Structure 1
Amino acid sequence: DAIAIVGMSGRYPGARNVREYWDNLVHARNAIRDIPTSRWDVCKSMGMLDDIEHFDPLFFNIPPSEAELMDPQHRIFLQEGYKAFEDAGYNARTLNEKKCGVYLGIMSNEYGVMLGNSFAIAAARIPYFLNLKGPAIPIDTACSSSLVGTHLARQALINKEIDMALVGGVSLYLTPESYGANGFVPGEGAGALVLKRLKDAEADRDHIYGIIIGSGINQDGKTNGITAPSAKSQMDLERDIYETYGIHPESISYVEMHGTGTGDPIELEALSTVFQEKTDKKQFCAIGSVKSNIGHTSAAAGVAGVQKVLLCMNHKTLVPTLNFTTPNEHFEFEHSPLYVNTELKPWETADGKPRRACVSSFGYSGTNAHIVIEEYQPERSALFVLSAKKEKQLKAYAEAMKDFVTSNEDIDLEDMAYTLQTGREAMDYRMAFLADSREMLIKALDDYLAEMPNGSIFAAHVKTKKSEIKLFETDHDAKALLQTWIEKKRLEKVAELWVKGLQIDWNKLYGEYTPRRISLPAYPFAEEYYWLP
C-alpha cells in the first residue's frame, strides 16, 4: 500500500546537506554561479557542487589509490547514500544482510572517458560496502532517472521482493564538451531516500518524512523529434495514477513541476487539464520548481524535488519558486486549478486533512515519471555518545551536533541521545557525556571542542583501553554490576566504560518509556582530495 520515506540525504548547489537546502529554499536563494576556470575556461553558468574531488576512501575500505580511479559521481553518491541510512537511524550492523534494493539514477560517464566506472558498479558500491542483498540497479532514463527508480523500488516493496530501498540520483558536469523561459541551466547534485513499507516503518518505530501513495511511469512515444514532449502522455500518466490509486485532484495542493524553463506550457496545460476533468475549483494548487533555485540537476532532479516537497510538508510551509515575473503567454492561469507560488507562506490545509503534493520528472528520451506524496500524521540526565574512525572526524562530528542543537531549540534530548546510542555505529574514537538540558548539552560540546576540562565529558581511543575493559566482558558479577549500573541510573559509569570500548545494551537503559529515533547530522567524512592520476 503506502510507502514511508524514513531517511534522506542531499547535496545540491549551495547546500552541503538537506538542512542548508531547506534554509536556502525558505530564503529564496539562487545557487547558480558563473563557471570558474578551475572547472574549465569558458551559457557560462552552472548550479555547481563544491569540492567534487573530496572523498573518504578509508571509511569505505577503499585504497586511496583506487579513489583517483573512481568517478566522483560514484564517490559522492556512496557518501550521500550512506548518510541517508544514518539519517534514518540505521547502521552497518543493522543493515547487514538486509534485503535492501538500491536504485540509482545516473546518466553520464565523463570521468571514465577522461581517464570500475560502469553504471552497474556505481549502483553496487553501497550494497558491497554494507552487505545488502536487494538488487542493485542503475537507471538511466535521463532526467526522470531518480523518479523512475523511486517507482521501481515502490513496486518491489509492495510486492515484498525487498524490505527496504535506497533510491537516489547523481549528476556532475565535468567537461566543456557535455555542456521569459529560455532553456535550462545545468545543475549538479546527489540525493538519496530510504524507503520502507509503511506498516514496517511504524512497527520499527522509524521517523517518517512522508508517504508515497501513488506513482507511475510511461513513454512519450512518437513525438516531433525524440526530445519533444507529448501533452497526451503527460495527461495519461497523471490521470492513470490518480484513477488507479483513488486520488482526487482537489486533495492536491502542491505540484513540484519538471519545470525546466524551456515544454513549460505543455506541462502546465496537461496537469491543468487533468485536474479540471475532476474539479471546477480555481487556483487551489500551488506549483513550483526547485530548478529555479539550483538549476537542472539531471539524474538527481527527481530526488531533489521529492526532498523539497517533504521538507515543505515537515515545516508545513510553501516556499517561493524563482525567476517568475510574468506568466508564460501560452497558458492562462486565472481560470486554472493552478497558481505559481512566489511567497514564503504557511501551507494551509482544511479540516486536518493531510497535505498532498506531486512531483513530475520527464526525460529527454521520453520516459516520464510522476509520484504523489502525502504528509504523514503520527499518533533527568541523558547519555550522549559520539564516535568516528579518526579523531579529526570525531571533532567535526561534535561541531555538527553543536550547530544542530543550537539551530534547533525544540530538540527532544532523550530522542537525540537514543538515536546516538542505537542509530549510530560505535567506532574507534569515542566521546560521551551527560546533559539534562539543551544548555548543558551545548556547553558540553563546546567544552569538548575548546578542550576545557569538564567532569561530565569522557573520551578515549578504543584500541588503547582494551586491557582496562576486559574486567567487565567475561565475569558474571561484573556484568551484574554493569547491568545494575545500566539497570539503571549511574550514567557516568556507563559513559566511562562505553568510550573505552565496552559494549552496552542500550535497551536496558529504558523501562517502558522508550524514546524514538530522530533525524540527526550524519557522519562528517574526511575531506581528502582525489582526482585524475
Structure 2
Amino acid sequence: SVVRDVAIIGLSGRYPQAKNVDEFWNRLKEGKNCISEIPKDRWDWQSFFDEEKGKKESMYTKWGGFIDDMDKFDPLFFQISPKEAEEMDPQERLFLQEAYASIEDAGYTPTTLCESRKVGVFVGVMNGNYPTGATYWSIANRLSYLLNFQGPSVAVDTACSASLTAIHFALESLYSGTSECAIAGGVNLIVDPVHYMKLSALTMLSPSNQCKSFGDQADGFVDGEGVGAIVLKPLDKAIADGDHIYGVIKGSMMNAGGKTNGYTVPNPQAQAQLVADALQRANVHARTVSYLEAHGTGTELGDPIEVAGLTRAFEKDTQDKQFCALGSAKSNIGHCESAAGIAGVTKILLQLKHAQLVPSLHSRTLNPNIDFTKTPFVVQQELAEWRRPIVEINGTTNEYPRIAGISSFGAGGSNAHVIIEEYIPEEQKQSSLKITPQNPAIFVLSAKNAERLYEIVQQLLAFIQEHSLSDEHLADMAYTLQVGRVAMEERIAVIAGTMKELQQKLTAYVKGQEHIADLYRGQVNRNQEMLDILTSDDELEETIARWMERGKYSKLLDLWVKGLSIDWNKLYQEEQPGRISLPTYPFAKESYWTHA
C-alpha cells in the first residue's frame, strides 16, 4: 500500500569504543576518533604487514574500528548449547542480543511487541569469514525463531549499504502490511585477517587511523565493526500506544548506479536520482533538510561524487547554498560496511534526542576538490545546537522540524537513502499517574540468575544517576519495567514513592543488606507446582484485580517474586503511562569460538 509515516520506537547498538548508544553519543559529542590497533586476539598484524599497497596476501594498515567483546555471548539465556554457540557466526550472536535489547529499549516483551506475531526481521550483512561459513539467513532467522516472530525474516546483502537496504525493505513490508512491526538493522565483524587482505589488495583502506570524510588528504577508509537494530512501527499506532519515539521515517529509496567507468565506481547521477526519489516519497522539500548523514567514506574518488549527487538532488528544489549541515559517523568509528547505515541512523537519532549537531572529524581542511560554497552543505566542525529551519516555500514562511537524510552506498553500486524527521508530541501532560508516597510505584526487576540481577540493579542505579532521573520519571519507569521486561526466574520488587527512596532501597540491596523495607526477593524455580494449578482460572485473575484496587501491594509483590503472574496493565484503569528507555538485559560475557 502507500508510503506512510513509521515511528522508530526502539534502538540498540554496539560500535567502536561505544558498548551502547549512550556511550556512542558521548564519543560523537566529544569528537572522539574511536580507531584502535588491530587486537592481537584477532590476529598479529605484523605477520601480514607490508607498506606496499595492493600487495597480495598482506595489509598496509594496523588500524580498525573494533568493538569490545566481539566473541562474547550468553547462549544459556537463549537455551543454546556451548557447542552450538561456538558454531554460530558472532555476527549472528551479537545481532540476536542487540535485537533483543532494542525491544527492551522500546519497552515491549517479545510477546507484547505484536500480538499477531507479524514482526518482520530485516538484517544487512556482507562478510562471512567465520570458520563455519557464511550463513547469513540465520542472523535473521535465529531471532525470528527464538522470539516467535512470523513476519518476513531475511538477510540482505547489498555490500556496504546493506543495513540501510534492510530498513528500506522493512518499511516496504510495513506499508504493504506483511509486517505490523519490524526489527531492522545490520552487522559487520572483522574475524579473519583475510578481511583486511582483500580490502588491502584493492587498496581501499587508509594506512592511517583517520577516515577523512570530505577532508583534505583523503586516502581511503578505516575498516570498522558495528551491530545495531531499531524497532519500527506505524506512527499512528506508536502514538496511540504511548511508545517513546526517536524519530519518524518519512520515506526511503533504493537504487543502483548502473554502468559507470568501471565496476564499483560510484555514479553521481544515480545517487542524485536516489535522493530526489526519497525526498519525493517523503514529501520533503530539500530546503527543509537541515542535516545530511553522508556515506562519507573518505576516498578521493567517492567523496566528491557524493557531494555532487546530493547537490544535484537538492537543486531540483532549491538553489540556496550552505544551509544544511553535513557529516559522517565514519569519521569517528570508521566504515563498518554492512552496519554503516544503522550506525549513521543511530547518530541521527542521538542528534535528534539532544537537538545537537556533532563534529564530523578530520575535515578542518576540506577536500580541496570540493567547493562547498557551490552546494547546499557545510561540513559540521563543532558541537552546535541543531536549529529548526525557517523556510519560505509556496510564498509561505514557516519553521520546520529537524529533518535529516542519510545515504549508504555499497561498493557494487547498490544505494539507499532514508529521510528521518523529529517527532514532536502533542502537549498532553495530565500527569494523573503522579508518583507520591501516597500513590507509590511498584518497581519490578528480574533476571535468569542472581549475578545478572545484581548487574541489572547496578546499571539501573547508574542510569538514574547518569540521566538525572527523578520523581517525575517514576511512573513511566515502573510501567516500562512492568510491561517491557520479561519476568525471569530471579526477582526483586520495590515499592517507592520517590526516586531517592528507590535509590536508597536499591543501593541497600547492592550493599548486601538482608532485610530491606518494602523490598521483596524470591525465585520462580521454587514454587512451580502451586503456580500451575491456580492461575488457570480467571477466578484468581479477578482476585488480583481486587488486591490491586484495594492496594495490597505487599501481598501482590510477595506473590509476584515467587512466580505469580500479574498483568500489570490492570494497575492502570484510567489512562496509561509511557514507555521509556532504561538499561537492557546485561547478557553474560562468555567467550565462544570454533576451530578452522
TM (normalized to structure 1)? Answer: 0.96
Which range moves more in the overlay, 270-279 or 177-186? 270-279
- 1:196-239 per-position Cα deviation (integer Å, ceiling 9, x unaligned): 11122223222211111111111111112211111111111112
Letter in 1 for 2:20: N
Q: Look up the match of 2:425.
A: 378
What is the alpha-carbon distance in structure 1 between the residues aligned to residue 65 and residue 492 of structure 2?
Answer: 38
Distance 1:47 1:507, change over 3 A: same
Paired residue secondary structure (1:110): coil
Give 1:15's match in structure 2, choosing from 15, 18, 32: 18
What is the alpha-carbon distance in structure 1 between the residues aligned to residue 529 and residue 122 of structure 2?
Answer: 45
**Structure 1 position 7, deviation (Å):** 0.8
Which range moves more in the overlay, 297-306 or 326-335? 326-335
Percent of pairs with identical residues? 47
Distance 1:467 1:247, change over 3 A: closer
Q: Look up the match of 1:510.
A: 572
Give 1:157's match in structure 2, choosing from 165, 174, 177: 174
Aligned-residue CA RMSD (Å): 1.9
Tell me, yes or no, if structure 1 residue 238 matches structure 2 residue 275. yes
Tell me, yes or no, if structure 1 residue 451 matches structure 2 residue 512. yes
What is the alpha-carbon distance in structure 1 between the residues aligned to residue 375 and residue 541 of structure 2?
Answer: 69
- 1:271-291 per-position Cα deviation (integer Å, ceiling 9, x unaligned): 123223322322210001000
The 8 Å contact of residues 70 and 117 in structure 1, kept in 2 or not, is answered as: no
What is the alpha-carbon distance in structure 1 between the residues aligned to residue 322 and residue 277 of structure 2?
Answer: 23
Which range moves more in the overlay, 11-20 or 462-471? 462-471
Give 1:409's match in structure 2, choosing from 468, 476, 490: 468
1:73-222 matches, within 5 Å, as: 73-95=91-113, 98-111=117-130, 114-115=131-132, 118-179=135-196, 180-222=217-259
**Structure 1 position 407, deviation (Å):** 1.0
Q: Look up the match of 1:312.
A: 351
What is the alpha-carbon distance in structure 2 between the residues aligned to residue 302 and residue 433 of structure 1?
Answer: 40
Paired residue secondary structure (1:208): coil
Which range moves more in the overlay, 259-268 or 395-404? 395-404
What is the alpha-carbon distance in structure 2 between the residues aligned to residue 275 and residue 122 of structure 1?
Answer: 37
Q: Look up the match of 1:282.
A: 321
What is the alpha-carbon distance in structure 2 between the residues aligned to residue 9 and residue 508 of structure 1?
Answer: 29
What is the alpha-carbon distance in structure 2 between the residues aligned to residue 523 and residue 477 of structure 1?
Answer: 34
Distance 1:83 1:476, change over 3 A: closer
Q: Look up the match of 1:27.
A: 30
What is the alpha-carbon distance in structure 1 between the residues aligned to residue 555 and residue 400 of structure 2?
Answer: 48
Aligned pair count reads 531
Give 2:496's match in structure 1, choosing from 401, 420, 435: 435
Letter in 2 for 1:358: G
Q: Look up the match of 2:199.
A: none
Tell me, yes or no, if structure 1 residue 41 matches structure 2 residue 44. yes
- 1:247-304 per-position Cα deviation (integer Å, ceiling 9, x unaligned): 2111100000000000001111221232233223222100010001111011100001
Paired residue secondary structure (2:193): coil
**Structure 1 position 92, deviation (Å):** 2.9
TM (normalized to structure 2)? Answer: 0.86
- 1:47-67 per-position Cα deviation (integer Å, ceiling 9, x unaligned): 001111111111112111111
Tell me, yes or no, if structure 1 residue 532 matches structure 2 residue 594. yes
Paired residue secondary structure (1:432): strand
Paired residue secondary structure (1:487): helix
Which range moves more in the overlay, 354-363 or 58-67? 58-67
What is the alpha-carbon distance in structure 2 between the residues aligned to residue 530 and residue 153 of structure 1?
Answer: 31
Paired residue secondary structure (1:165): strand
Q: Look up the match of 2:51.
A: none
The 8 Å contact of residues 70 and 116 in structure 1, kept in 2 or not, is answered as: no
Paired residue secondary structure (1:77): helix
Q: Look up the match of 1:519.
A: 581
What is the alpha-carbon distance in structure 1 between the residues aligned to residue 163 and residue 539 of structure 2?
Answer: 54
What is the alpha-carbon distance in structure 2 between the residues aligned to residue 298 and residue 476 of structure 1?
Answer: 52
Distance 1:337 1:402, change over 3 A: same
Q: Look up the match of 2:367.
A: 328
**Structure 1 position 477, deviation (Å):** 8.3
**Structure 1 position 335, deviation (Å):** 3.8
Q: Look up the match of 1:359.
A: 406
Unmatched 5+ stretches in structure 2: 46-60, 197-216, 391-397, 427-435
**Structure 1 position 191, deviation (Å):** 0.3
Unmatched 5+ stretches in structure 1: none
- 1:448-486 per-position Cα deviation (integer Å, ceiling 9, x unaligned): 111123212111111224577789747998766543331
The 8 Å contact of residues 488 and 509 in structure 1, kept in 2 or not, is answered as: no
Give 2:415's match in structure 1, choosing from 348, 368, 383: 368
Distance 1:471 1:495, change over 3 A: farther
Letter in 2 for 1:290: A
What is the alpha-carbon distance in structure 2 between the residues aligned to residue 332 and residue 383 of structure 1?
Answer: 59
What is the alpha-carbon distance in structure 1 between the residues aligned to residue 7 and residue 537 of structure 2?
Answer: 44
Paired residue secondary structure (2:83): helix
Letter in 1 for 2:561: V
The 8 Å contact of residues 356 and 374 in structure 1, kept in 2 or not, is answered as: yes
The 8 Å contact of residues 103 and 110 in structure 2, kept in 1 or not, is answered as: no
Distance 1:478 1:303, change over 3 A: closer
Letter in 1 for 2:362: N
Distance 1:62 1:476, change over 3 A: closer
The 8 Å contact of residues 242 and 577 in structure 2, kept in 1 or not, is answered as: no
The 8 Å contact of residues 258 and 362 in structure 1, kept in 2 or not, is answered as: yes
Paired residue secondary structure (2:372): coil
**Structure 1 position 410, deviation (Å):** 3.8
**Structure 1 position 528, deviation (Å):** 1.0
Paired residue secondary structure (1:309): helix
Which range moves more in the overlay, 13-22 or 345-354? 345-354
Distance 1:93 1:214, change over 3 A: closer
What is the alpha-carbon distance in structure 1 between the residues aligned to residue 544 and residue 258 of structure 2?
Answer: 67
Q: Look up the match of 2:523.
A: 461
Give 2:87's match in structure 1, choosing from 69, 74, 95: 69
Tell me, yes or no, if structure 1 residue 256 matches structure 2 residue 293. yes
The 8 Å contact of residues 491 and 561 in structure 2, kept in 1 or not, is answered as: yes
What is the alpha-carbon distance in structure 2 between the residues aligned to residue 518 and residue 288 of structure 1?
Answer: 29
Tell me, yes or no, if structure 1 residue 226 matches structure 2 residue 263. yes
**Structure 1 position 519, deviation (Å):** 1.3
Paired residue secondary structure (1:184): coil
Give 2:70's match in structure 1, choosing from 52, 61, 85: 52
What is the alpha-carbon distance in structure 1 between the residues aligned to residue 490 and residue 259 of structure 2?
Answer: 59
Distance 1:468 1:408, change over 3 A: farther
**Structure 1 position 508, deviation (Å):** 2.4
- 1:405-434 per-position Cα deviation (integer Å, ceiling 9, x unaligned): 111224511001000001111111101101
The 8 Å contact of residues 487 and 508 in structure 1, kept in 2 or not, is answered as: no
